[PDB]
Symmetry: T
Subunit: 62 residues, 12 copies
Amino acid sequence: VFKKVLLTGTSEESFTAAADDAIDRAEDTLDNVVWAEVVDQGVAIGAVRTYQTEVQVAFELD
Amino acid sequence: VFKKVLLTGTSEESFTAAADDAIDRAEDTLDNVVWAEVVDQGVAIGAVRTYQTEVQVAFELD
Amino acid sequence: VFKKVLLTGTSEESFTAAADDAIDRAEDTLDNVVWAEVVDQGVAIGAVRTYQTEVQVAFELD
Amino acid sequence: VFKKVLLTGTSEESFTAAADDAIDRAEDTLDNVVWAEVVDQGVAIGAVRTYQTEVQVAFELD
Amino acid sequence: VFKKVLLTGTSEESFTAAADDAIDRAEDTLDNVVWAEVVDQGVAIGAVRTYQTEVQVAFELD
Amino acid sequence: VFKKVLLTGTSEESFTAAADDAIDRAEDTLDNVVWAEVVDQGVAIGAVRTYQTEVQVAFELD
Amino acid sequence: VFKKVLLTGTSEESFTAAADDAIDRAEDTLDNVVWAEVVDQGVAIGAVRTYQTEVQVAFELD
Amino acid sequence: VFKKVLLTGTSEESFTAAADDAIDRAEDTLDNVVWAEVVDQGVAIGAVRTYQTEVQVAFELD
Amino acid sequence: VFKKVLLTGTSEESFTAAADDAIDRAEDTLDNVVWAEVVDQGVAIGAVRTYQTEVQVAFELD
Amino acid sequence: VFKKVLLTGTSEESFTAAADDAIDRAEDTLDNVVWAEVVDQGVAIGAVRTYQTEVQVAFELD
Amino acid sequence: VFKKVLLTGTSEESFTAAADDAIDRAEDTLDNVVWAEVVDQGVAIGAVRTYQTEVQVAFELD
Amino acid sequence: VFKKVLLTGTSEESFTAAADDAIDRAEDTLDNVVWAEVVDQGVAIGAVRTYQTEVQVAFELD
Ligand SMILES: Cc1cc2nc3c(=O)[nH]c(=O)nc-3n(CCCCNC(=O)O)c2cc1C
Ligand SMILES: Cc1cc2nc3c(=O)[nH]c(=O)nc-3n(CCCCNC(=O)O)c2cc1C
Ligand SMILES: Cc1cc2nc3c(=O)[nH]c(=O)nc-3n(CCCCNC(=O)O)c2cc1C
Ligand SMILES: Cc1cc2nc3c(=O)[nH]c(=O)nc-3n(CCCCNC(=O)O)c2cc1C
Ligand SMILES: Cc1cc2nc3c(=O)[nH]c(=O)nc-3n(CCCCNC(=O)O)c2cc1C
Ligand SMILES: Cc1cc2nc3c(=O)[nH]c(=O)nc-3n(CCCCNC(=O)O)c2cc1C
Ligand SMILES: Cc1cc2nc3c(=O)[nH]c(=O)nc-3n(CCCCNC(=O)O)c2cc1C
Ligand SMILES: Cc1cc2nc3c(=O)[nH]c(=O)nc-3n(CCCCNC(=O)O)c2cc1C
Ligand SMILES: Cc1cc2nc3c(=O)[nH]c(=O)nc-3n(CCCCNC(=O)O)c2cc1C
Ligand SMILES: Cc1cc2nc3c(=O)[nH]c(=O)nc-3n(CCCCNC(=O)O)c2cc1C
Ligand SMILES: Cc1cc2nc3c(=O)[nH]c(=O)nc-3n(CCCCNC(=O)O)c2cc1C
Ligand SMILES: Cc1cc2nc3c(=O)[nH]c(=O)nc-3n(CCCCNC(=O)O)c2cc1C
Ligand SMILES: [Cl-]
Ligand SMILES: [Cl-]
Ligand SMILES: [Cl-]
Ligand SMILES: [Cl-]
Ligand SMILES: [Mg+2]
Ligand SMILES: [Mg+2]
Ligand SMILES: [Mg+2]
Ligand SMILES: [Mg+2]
Ligand SMILES: [Mg+2]
Ligand SMILES: [Mg+2]
Ligand SMILES: [Mg+2]
Ligand SMILES: [Mg+2]
Ligand SMILES: [Mg+2]
Ligand SMILES: [Mg+2]
Ligand SMILES: [Mg+2]
Ligand SMILES: [Mg+2]
Ligand SMILES: [Mg+2]
Ligand SMILES: [Mg+2]
Ligand SMILES: [Mg+2]
Ligand SMILES: [Mg+2]
Ligand SMILES: [Mg+2]
Ligand SMILES: [Mg+2]
Ligand SMILES: [Mg+2]
Ligand SMILES: [Mg+2]
Ligand SMILES: [Mg+2]
Ligand SMILES: [Mg+2]
Ligand SMILES: [Mg+2]
Ligand SMILES: [Mg+2]
Ligand code: NA
Ligand code: NA
Ligand code: NA
Ligand code: NA
């Protein structure tokens, strides 16, 4: 059985690096992280631009 | 990093109040709740009508 | 077996009350109305604003 | 010919009132506003909750 | 309030049995599981075929 | 001209058998049923699990 | 209150004429037909090509 | 950079001619119109039928 | 077994004629072409307007 | 690099068996078939019912 | 009230840089640009490849 | 007439570079490749992360 958690990663560099930020967090906390699916991307536009990539991060249960 | 939980709030009054019911629960349980996105709305039709609003509730991790 | 009819309710007050207007009509005409799913919302903007909520209204057959 | 502008209205009260806030702004600025279609709803959760309703606001050109 | 978890069940037999595998896991771990909504289906094609059914599994909170 | 009715069939066995339950009902009641399109699937989880398959059932008019 | 019926019109000429074929049928049978929304288009390719246009046909109830 | 405006053209003849009506208006008003994407089609059913085609009309900025 | 190929037909006349252009090409090249499903429509706006209709063209294998 | 082909399998038994029919055909013809994603399901209703499952069948190139 | 404009940015380098190109243009022309949502990405393939990222760029009105 | 093939490119570097990997393969094999549309993005998470970008790659026929 796989389970997915819905995480939004952030980066001041790129959409790829924002996906990684979410995956990094998942791997800190979860065992058996196996894949991620991009579901949305955006940019917070303030003092700097922050690229955001929202991913479903799949991990194998047990 | 943001995380979202997928909650369905309920109200005998309105779709807005059903969204609030979900957010109320999130805030009871989670720190740093920052936004909600409506993903569905419905009505359970029994003795009374119960309005339901399903929301992705985003919170900041750490 | 459930069947759904696709109804647009209207209200000069709110989206919730427009959903109810559709459900009211369904219940006038159909037995065993059990739930409704919101599929669209809009506003007709004339002399007054009329809120519209389109719902699939599910009823149990037999 | 109709044209649509993509506006997000806000309210501390309800999704219906947030739709109205967008329509109010459209009518301040545009002639012949004829309808609105809801495309998204959300809630900004800070000191207070701010309900947001995003609408395509249609107006007749000329 | 209902909450949903996003689970992918697996079976070497059928899409129905893969949905059950996810629900089985939910029920092992959660109280008050009330429904599931299919969101995706697939097949891993290796030595054998493994049918997968992804479901939002809804449970009542408290 | 074809017309579609939106029916949810149920089965304690499988998604295929729930689709059939809807089609069975359509054929009881309608002439010239020609096809069905699956639009949703779910499971009601109570004492037993009830698989549901929602189909648009197309029939030829006249 | 508006109600919609889901009809597929056909024509050996065009997608527009297939939409009309569905609307023609609706008007034969229903009072107060007010609008149609295209939801799908296709072509049956046999001895001849038959253009099909599927429309939600809205009519005002009462 | 391209920008899109969301226009609904109308015709008493066809969906193609309603798309053209929107493009005609865009070209009256905008420089460097380069393409259009159909996003919706409908029919207003009154004294006569008016075919509507909604298009995103893309133009190159500067 | 059916297979679909994803083709964009073009016409200086209409969306219907652009669908035909794709089907014409399919039939030149493939045996047992049975149906087409419209998936997109657009217009290239240059010296002349070129209507485009993108279709999944289904053919029976063997 | 993966490539997908869009195939509709058929079965007089089940949606699972119709998915298999498509995969069977893919494997007859293609090397390195690795997965399938369900994209649609339907039923042809004639003398008998024929369950159809449409799948994107992914294979690794080279 | 927020308003969104639908812009396609371009870059010979990356999807992130194409999003920036659109945001750059928005900021040249508009006050109070606050966020962007990616809605599409593509590549024009000619002499060189040009990455395109289409964004809804949100700005606060007044 | 344009035709599209559905390819998933891969890169250990970025989503942009994974799109390129798919386009590279298309150009190896096909004449008159003209554009690509991103349809999905993901990450395979193993020993290393492999970014994947799925594109419809359009080419002109003849
Ligand atoms: C993709 C996306 C979508 C967003 N949508 C909304 C929104 O819908 N309402 C709102 O008030 N704020 C935002 N916002 C938040 C705007 C904050 C940008 N400002 C600073 O970062 O300082 C938002 C942000 C992003 C990245
Ligand atoms: C939005 C939505 C969708 C629903 N869908 C289903 C459904 O698909 N199957 C089913 O058996 N029950 C329901 N139901 C549950 C019907 C219960 C209504 N009856 C009472 O509340 O007493 C359902 C409910 C709601 C609100
Ligand atoms: C959600 C929605 C969508 C609509 N779409 C269209 C439309 O697409 N074309 C059109 O001519 N009229 C309308 N209209 C109808 C415009 C009528 C508003 N005027 C008055 O109520 O007097 C429409 C209305 C609504 C509520
Ligand atoms: C619907 C929606 C969506 C949003 N999405 C994002 C987002 O995706 N990223 C982000 O940084 N901020 C937001 N935000 C902004 C969060 C700000 C909430 N805080 C305060 O209002 O003080 C956002 C807001 C809303 C309403
Ligand atoms: C629905 C679905 C989707 C998939 N998508 C991808 C994918 O997008 N990339 C990838 O590398 N692998 C897979 N895969 C994994 C391919 C593994 C199949 N091989 C074996 O089971 O041994 C995948 C699998 C399934 C079931
Ligand atoms: C697909 C689907 C979706 C559903 N959605 C809702 C829902 O959204 N609200 C709700 O109150 N009940 C349901 N329900 C109904 C829950 C009832 C399960 N319990 C028993 O069957 O005894 C529901 C059911 C199904 C099958
Ligand atoms: C849009 C659309 C979609 C279709 N889909 C299917 C399908 O999914 N399965 C199937 O067996 N037949 C069809 N078919 C039916 C194929 C019949 C074409 N042959 C003749 O008209 O003689 C179909 C038709 C159309 C118009
Ligand atoms: C595609 C589309 C959608 C529409 N939707 C709505 C609607 O949702 N509500 C409503 O009141 N009117 C309309 N209407 C407007 C109905 C007006 C038809 N009557 C006359 O043209 O005289 C509408 C129209 C069209 C073309
Ligand atoms: C539906 C659709 C979508 C399109 N999208 C893009 C696009 O996204 N980028 C781009 O550079 N060109 C185009 N283009 C191409 C613009 C070319 C129009 N000019 C001439 O035909 O001479 C495009 C075209 C069409 C028909
Ligand atoms: C999912 C799906 C969708 C379909 N859609 C259409 C359609 O849209 N038009 C049409 O003429 N025929 C069909 N058809 C074909 C109807 C043929 C059923 N009759 C027999 O099998 O003998 C169709 C079939 C299926 C399975
Ligand atoms: C995402 C996207 C989509 C596109 N769609 C179309 C299209 O649908 N029709 C068409 O004629 N041209 C294009 N085109 C335009 C093809 C032009 C590529 N050639 C050169 O850049 O020189 C197009 C382009 C892009 C980027
Ligand atoms: C986007 C996407 C989606 C995927 N979906 C599935 C899936 O649905 N089932 C499954 O078994 N495997 C996968 N997989 C495959 C998991 C393999 C990751 N492991 C290694 O790369 O070693 C998958 C992969 C990717 C990239
Ligand atoms: Cl828009
Ligand atoms: Cl989710
Ligand atoms: Cl419907
Ligand atoms: Cl495809
Ligand atoms: Mg930096
Ligand atoms: Mg988002
Ligand atoms: Mg009360
Ligand atoms: Mg729901
Ligand atoms: Mg009042
Ligand atoms: Mg509507
Ligand atoms: Mg207040
Ligand atoms: Mg939004
Ligand atoms: Mg076995
Ligand atoms: Mg999946
Ligand atoms: Mg049993
Ligand atoms: Mg459902
Ligand atoms: Mg003829
Ligand atoms: Mg169809
Ligand atoms: Mg005329
Ligand atoms: Mg519309
Ligand atoms: Mg000509
Ligand atoms: Mg297109
Ligand atoms: Mg049998
Ligand atoms: Mg289909
Ligand atoms: Mg360069
Ligand atoms: Mg695009
Ligand atoms: Mg590297
Ligand atoms: Mg994918
Ligand atoms: Na989730
Ligand atoms: Na219907
Ligand atoms: Na717009
Ligand atoms: Na394809």
